[PDB]
Amino acid sequence: RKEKRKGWNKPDAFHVCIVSYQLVVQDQHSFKRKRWQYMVLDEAHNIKN
DNA sequence: CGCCCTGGAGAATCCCGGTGCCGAGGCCGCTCAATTGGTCGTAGACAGCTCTAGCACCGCTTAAACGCACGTACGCGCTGTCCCCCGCGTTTTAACCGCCAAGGGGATTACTCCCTAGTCTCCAGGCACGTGTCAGATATATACATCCTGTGCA
């Protein structure tokens, strides 16, 4: 993940990113820094709580 | 034939932004032991006087300190050996959350009696002190006890 995040910030290396549900719990501090346009949730019956 | 010195390579570090996050401090409400004064009685500093071991000293009387000479043997330097834990990759488990919500007992706060001991008081007696007495260690008569000497002998 560090190797994925070293081409991350300054330029645009991707038009979309694929991140698992549970990884945003640990990496929430890193993912909250970058601005985003669309964040979509699959099978929302998880987050329902 | 194989080793210091150089050069290429790699990665670990330092430092400078860049944005989200939370408790340090400020602000208020409040509220209780510090502050001020008076009363009261009480131990500490000031002599006072005394008395007693520390101080400085002098001179026998040994007795450790010292200087040195020898020495020998273990601390140390060097060398060969080998093996054991570090570095790294691959396997395996501990712990967090999600589900899906309930109580539970133990220190806290507040209240409530109740009785053990501080304080005061007087009566008595007991252990620090002075003296009696024996234990141990000390210094000296003493009855033989071992050389020395007249001394008489064969």
UniProtKB/Swiss-Prot annotation:
Q: Name its species.
A: Saccharomyces cerevisiae (strain ATCC 204508 / S288c)
What task does this protein carry out? Catalytic component of the SWR1 complex which mediates the ATP-dependent exchange of histone H2A for the H2A variant HZT1 leading to transcriptional regulation of selected genes by chromatin remodeling.
Assembly and partners are described as: Component of the SWR1 chromatin-remodeling complex composed of at least ACT1, ARP4, RVB1, RVB2, ARP6, YAF9, VPS71, VPS72, SWC3, SWC4, SWC5, SWC7 and SWR1, and perhaps BDF1.
Q: Where is this motif: DEAH box?
A: 42-45
Tell me more from the record.
Present with 656 molecules/cell in log phase SD medium.
So what family is this one in? Belongs to the SNF2/RAD54 helicase family. SWR1 subfamily.
In Swiss-Prot or TrEMBL terms, this protein is called Helicase SWR1
The shown range, given as first to last of full length, is: 783 to 831 of 1514
Indicate where this protein resides in the cell: Nucleus
